[PDB]
Amino acid sequence: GLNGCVETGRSRSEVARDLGLSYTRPLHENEKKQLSHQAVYYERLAKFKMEQPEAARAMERERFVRKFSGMFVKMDIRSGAPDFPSTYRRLLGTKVVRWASKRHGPN
Amino acid sequence: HATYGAVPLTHSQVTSVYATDGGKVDELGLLELVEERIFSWKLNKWEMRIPPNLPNDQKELIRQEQENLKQILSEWRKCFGALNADILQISSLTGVPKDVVREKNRTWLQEEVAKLRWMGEVNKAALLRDAFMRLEAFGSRDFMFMERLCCIYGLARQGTFDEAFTNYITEDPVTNDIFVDERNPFKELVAHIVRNYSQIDIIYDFLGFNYSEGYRSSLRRYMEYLQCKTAENVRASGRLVTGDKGEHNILFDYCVSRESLVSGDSCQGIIDFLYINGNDVTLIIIASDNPWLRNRQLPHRRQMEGIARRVCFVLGIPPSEVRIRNLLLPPTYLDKGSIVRLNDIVFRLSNEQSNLLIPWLTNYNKELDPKDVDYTALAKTTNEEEWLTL
Amino acid sequence: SRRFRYNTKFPALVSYNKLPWEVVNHETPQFHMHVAPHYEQLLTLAASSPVPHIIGSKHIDVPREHRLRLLPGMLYLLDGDTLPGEFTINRVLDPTALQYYGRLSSQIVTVEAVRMLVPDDLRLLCNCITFKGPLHLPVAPYASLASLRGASQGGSNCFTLYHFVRPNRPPKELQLEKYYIHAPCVAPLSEFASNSDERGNWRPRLQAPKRTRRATPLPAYRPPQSYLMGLAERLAVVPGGCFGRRSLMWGHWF
Amino acid sequence: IPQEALHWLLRMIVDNFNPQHVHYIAAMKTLQSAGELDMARDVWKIMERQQTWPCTATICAYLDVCVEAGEKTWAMEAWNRYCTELKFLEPGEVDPKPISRVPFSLTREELLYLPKWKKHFDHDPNLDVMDLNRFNRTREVYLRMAQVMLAGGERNAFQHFFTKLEEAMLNKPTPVPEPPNPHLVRRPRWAPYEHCKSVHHSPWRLQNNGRALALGPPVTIEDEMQSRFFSNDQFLVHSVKEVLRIVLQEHKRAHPTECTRCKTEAFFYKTKDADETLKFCDDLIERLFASLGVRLSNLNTSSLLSTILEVFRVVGKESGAALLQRANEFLERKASLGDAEGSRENLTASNYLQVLSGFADESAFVYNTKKDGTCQYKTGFDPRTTMRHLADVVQEIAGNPHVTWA
Amino acid sequence: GGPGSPVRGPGYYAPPMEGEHQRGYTAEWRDLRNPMRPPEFPTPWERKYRQ
Amino acid sequence: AGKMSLTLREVNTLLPLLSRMRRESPNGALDARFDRVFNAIDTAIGAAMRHNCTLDELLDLAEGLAACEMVPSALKQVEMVLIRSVMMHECSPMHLRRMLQAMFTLM
Amino acid sequence: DIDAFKYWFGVKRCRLSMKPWALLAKAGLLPPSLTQNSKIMPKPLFDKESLMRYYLANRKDEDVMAREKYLNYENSMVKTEEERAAERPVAPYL
Amino acid sequence: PWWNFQTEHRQRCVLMYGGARTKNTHNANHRVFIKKYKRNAFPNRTRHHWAVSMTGVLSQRPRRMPWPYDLTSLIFNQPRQGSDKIGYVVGTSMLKTAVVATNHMVYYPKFNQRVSRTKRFFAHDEDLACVEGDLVHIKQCRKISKYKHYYVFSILEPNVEGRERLKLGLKAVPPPLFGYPVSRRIVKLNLTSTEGTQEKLAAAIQEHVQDAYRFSGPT
Amino acid sequence: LKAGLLGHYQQEAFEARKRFEESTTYPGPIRAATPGDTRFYSGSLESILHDTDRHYWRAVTDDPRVQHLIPLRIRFKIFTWVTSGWEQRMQVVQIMAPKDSTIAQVKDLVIVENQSPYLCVSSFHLAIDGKELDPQKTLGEYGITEQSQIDAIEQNDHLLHRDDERPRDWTVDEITAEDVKRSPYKEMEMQPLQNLAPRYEARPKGYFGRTYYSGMKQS
RNA sequence: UAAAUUAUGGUCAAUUGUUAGUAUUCAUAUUAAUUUUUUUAAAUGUUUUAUCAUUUUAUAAAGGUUUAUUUUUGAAAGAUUUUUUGUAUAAAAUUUUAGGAAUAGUUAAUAAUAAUUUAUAAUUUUGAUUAGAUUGUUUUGUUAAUGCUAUUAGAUGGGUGUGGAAAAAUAAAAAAAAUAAUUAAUAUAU
Ligand SMILES: [Mg+2]
Ligand SMILES: [Mg+2]
Asked: What GO terms fall under cellular component here (chain G) (predicted)?
């Protein structure tokens, strides 16, 4: 389970997944907190949706109003780019003041 | 082809599965028919012949053995094609019928070449002379006969080639009836090989066809068979064979030197067999494929003197007439000269009595491979050595 | 991340059930435009082949809780003008809405009354059409309409169709696609069968008669005198604005 | 044009792709559906020149075009090259084979010391031949080789192949059918935009919709399953049906003037080789009825009866009432061998189609003959009797609601 | 040259290469400037065009 | 297909159903259709041993592995987290009874 | 470029301006264009009765016209029976 | 005659644009630099521009170019450049994301030498098996995150010491004591008692006041 | 990485591998597990409309799609009209039922595969030789084979209300057609595709014109 | 420290100008002058329609400034088939500053379209962000030169959610749905 499949193009993890093998490093407390707290917020948000409908309806309504009335909601090449301050970096000085820098990752 | 559940066969299941009764089976005709069926194939017929449910090392050894069988059959195919081309060329240049070419003479060759040179055709005369010269060495119907028989025995030994010789659609030559033949000449030929040639596994391993275990067990069975026909009163307990005449006729299977030779060790002298014949002592060693281990495999002179002194201590034989000699055998096969030297030195047999005891020894034409020169130098320095007297 | 699971191609769209321009209202004559050709083909099917559950002896008695779930999409014919309970009777008197039963009333049984039944919860319509017998189509003895007294006889001749639909849906809902089996009518072949006495009275025509006179010529073609719209073979107009192919132009002014 | 089906395979090899077996199957089936048999043999020669060993499905797809062309030499070459080692299924063997070839992977050592041509993996179709012969389609081979020997005129080879197929379908178990492959297409999962025009969208005619078929079928279907999903006795019935279909095909090939709608005088009467042909067909039907006992009561014989009626209509010039009588006698014979009181089945739409086409072949005529306007009919043709036998048959079909007209 | 150019190495001298690049740059790549021999054909199309 | 991953709650819910389908089978073992099911369990267990686990989830996992007779591929991380759960303060004699019965039915 | 022109003309179905059409009609690849007018010969005048009379005077057979269209449009290399008798295998396999 | 590649490129430019190139592009123009700011008062913190700076990515001096002949081209047969890579895992602080440092070669033809530059990529591992210290083989894929378009295809060499340190409850790699500073000013570590922090604060604020007094200049 | 140390590493890649095959002892051939699906396809992101959980090419069919089926044919009592009157006949519906299925599942398979508006008109019940069958029992518990005669006795006073939410061709891989209209055992394996359109290459890569010097094959 | 082996029995050479290609002038060549030449003054008719409307007609310039680039499933091509379905939205890679330090609508996970959560998050001394200069480009020039020196294809998140695609406030043709004209040259001033 340390070698990927050249024929099917599967990863190193997917070959071990199809063999029933477990390759996982011993996690720390924060790495277990990252994987254990995913369900807790879902049960909290579902309990808020079931228990307070008059507030969840207003929150979803204002979220849909903020989503629908936006200026860049049309799917385009600019909206479809993964890194907007890096691909369109000539707008960050004179046109767009949202991003103050053009580099945020290793690219 | 290869099916789920196919297995490679040893000699016992080849003997048991192909055990049919036949009377006056033509060896050469069935051999030529089975080889004509083999040569009519393509390369795609050799693809799916390895059984799937096997470990990878066994599959690799089976693939090497099948590749060896395929290349030897292809070499015999091109040799037979050259033979038929030369016979057709001689029958076309001379004008003699084709079936009487193999019974012709050298005086007849001189007369036909002089007749071609008298008419002014020196090119056709040179072609006829060269075709007859390369036909005298290759033109026999039984030329590689033991090697071809061992190839067909190996094709039966794989176990996946038995159904590849039947269920063909043919035409009758005189009436033009399209039919399907269910006759399997491969099964009849392998049955006749198993019935007549009782030591076909020994010739099969001695020619270097066995890639799995080698020829060492076949060598032990061959030496036990040759001891049982010379001492004639033989007891066999495990790895020790002894004659009970009072005269020392002892064959001791010491160890297998392929696994005994640890790579990276300092231990001088590891032998395979020990044969005490009267007063003579022979250390029968099969050489290794490692050339850095062949110099470590042969024992020292002091070690041979110690072994002879142990023979004097145990057997009670006086040390005045005690001789010990090393014997080196080729690693992957066993050529004709090695078997002749084994019959001369170990069992004290000449050529005529070895041909009387062993019928297939006369047609055994295996020789040393030219690309292994250091083994031939070591065997020349070893086999030409005098008997070490204690 | 969540943005890089799939692309934005083919997003989730609003269905036609919540768009008012895609939903047909039953107070309009457009409701009876979609559903009236489905009735005139079902009565053609029920008069030529036995439809299993198209004719009952009473209204199907589902419970009041299962009334909205099982009834829409169901059709059955009953004898006489008997309406189900817990409905408000609205008779269709609009000639714009009654005009789509013209082929149903002329070539098949005469349409007497079309009623829309709206319940107390206003969620399950019923389109009730009362026909007066007999049929203008020949009815097979093995057909479903042979077991109906109002259809077989030539008050006692009245029979009513009942079709349950949901009020505000697209016209995909009020479709009857399981009744478009085209069963043949053996009325021209019943003359020559063994069951008829007219089987020996017809004379076969194995050869065409010898024509001494040719066909009558058409009258003299007079070209039009008004301004035409142009060549209909390149304005993509069908041969009369009605049917045909533009590549095969015919029936126009030239 | 159908030649593009040969073109896009060739551009597959010019662009350095290895054509899989599904590409050869699709090319041969697309060229066979358009009547291009030589182009299908060119696809087979392309597959042979790529040194690809065909699977059993590619072998069957080649044998279909060897059967339709009537060329026994091509099928004998394909047999002697590939199908000499095909065996039927045994009760001791497992019915599906396990997957033998592990998918291609490289370790941390083999990535380094192996050369780049050993570490290269193209989708070579010769690697998965043992995993494409997993479902034992040998009965579809021995049937096809039984048909082409019928086409070439070899009775002994046909008898050998049919006897082996009959013994295998009587004494060996049924193989597990191969499931259909849904990964061969790139169709969408759902309709992206829901919009459907009505059936009555046009006020001038009834049109077909994408939801429902409202105009009725133009051609009757047999309403049967594929040959791989059949049992062994059902495949024996299908084998007898296919041999009778190839008898019909070779009779139409040998006598094309006497098998189409009239166009000449010779359509009305039987050929001189029709009696031995119908004798061979009757002997095959009686061999099928003698091999299968009461089990033929529990088998679908709709396509078999339709092919029997087509053989005894086209090859033997029989009336439509005789075809209806033969179909009723066949169904009563099938219902009588169950040794119970039973209940007989009806004729299907494909069975009634042969009776109606026999009625149409009775009244058929040579239009506009040499006398300029006189249609020539069959000698002894009675229009009243044929019309009376047509009308009650049409009423019998219309009385049965389970027969869908087309 | 990279994108849209068939040049693979410098004309005369190069930094030290290993493996198949060493065998390619010195022996096996194309060379139309060779006045004695054209760039070679694959096997076996070089034996019959030896003269 | 890698579209979803099972946590320990989904395994503790699926194991009694598969044990019930094993008990309802004519043979003692299940059909070969579910070999991809148990493999999806087999990767879900050995990953969950690297995360946090309460005692009741470990008890339900051990009882589910004992109900339908399946030996997981890891078998050592499960015993390592069962060693850590013996001397806990929340451990009950009912918990030790379930653990010992499950380990005797498995081993 | 003849082959690229035939690829973009037949397979890709390009458009043509009148000056390349006249230039390729000078090469024998195309007929003369629509705009190359002989100003001494006026345009033809069609009437359907004379066209029907000429069509009924000499029209081709149905199968002959179908085989002509098959040779012109579908493929032109259809093997004869003498070549089908050569493409089939021989007695060692037959 | 054997034409070079420039003839083919000129042919491509002629077939595209109708003509190869307009003449007289050199012009020998005297590009003069006119300074505006004061002597050591350029408005930048790192790079102070005082000469004519050339503009160009691949047409500048000294000339660079990518060198495609390296370990990756010797091992992997690639469908395109940068598809398969081999590197080392340096960071696993993110979930399902291994930071992989890989190397490539840049060629200088003037000095005739190749140099190894380093690029860091974000790769994806679902089962969390990549430890810092693994020699891994990553491959290109779809966009997974904003900066994740590679995935760990194989672990060619696992860090055994990192896994054994993770089994001990320690970090896989002990963290470095050196790194990036926070300013150009010398970060002095303050070690004082709890009572002597106010005078140290007074000295620090006085030093900041003198650094602000440096704005005044002379006197 | 340093490429000059590659080939000696290859010797180690030899000297470990030959050390491996002689050290361990292979017990036997492990059975081949079926491969899953990877989420790391090359190129851009696909849509959810075309996500069929298969991003590579597999020419063979594995075990989760293999089903063991029995061709069960079930008879129905129908009535046809003759010149005298009604006559009772038999209409047979053939299904492929799995071997480990129950009789209620066989009834559901008969309901979804009849494709006739005159057969499954009301609630019916399966029986053999008049004796009714328990719908919660397996076919193997009754010894039901292909030759076993199964009848469907109807009760025409009721009305069968079915709700077809399961598609007709539902396998484990969840690839269903919306306009299928046929049982998957009835449809052919390969047919002509009339919905697609044949498209040729219209964008040349490097060759555009007069003289083919190199063709820009590296691109 | 092997100790001069003895027919010396074959000498008669080379050059007939036919070539496996970076070759070097510290003073000569490139730049401006001794010489340049020739014009240009805006204020403007795209067309079909069913007529106060609708159908077709998608990269002008200055400014601001970019490490990089390409391909619509949708319109046409285009066909006696048909679903706004026929894989376009991605990657590697290479910039510069005489007085070199910090950066952020931030990184990954995610039952999360439209993130109320989790994390020991991400970039950077292998040179980041900002400020300056700034289309790039084996197309130019020079030389013996893998050196130095030049460039003018382009693009453009608030003008209108129309349209397949914003590229839309102006371009000697790209002839734009009846052959307007297709002989030739000026093809523009006029
Ligand atoms: Mg279009
Ligand atoms: Mg969280």
From this structure: cytoplasm; kinetoplast; mitochondrial small ribosomal subunit; mitochondrion
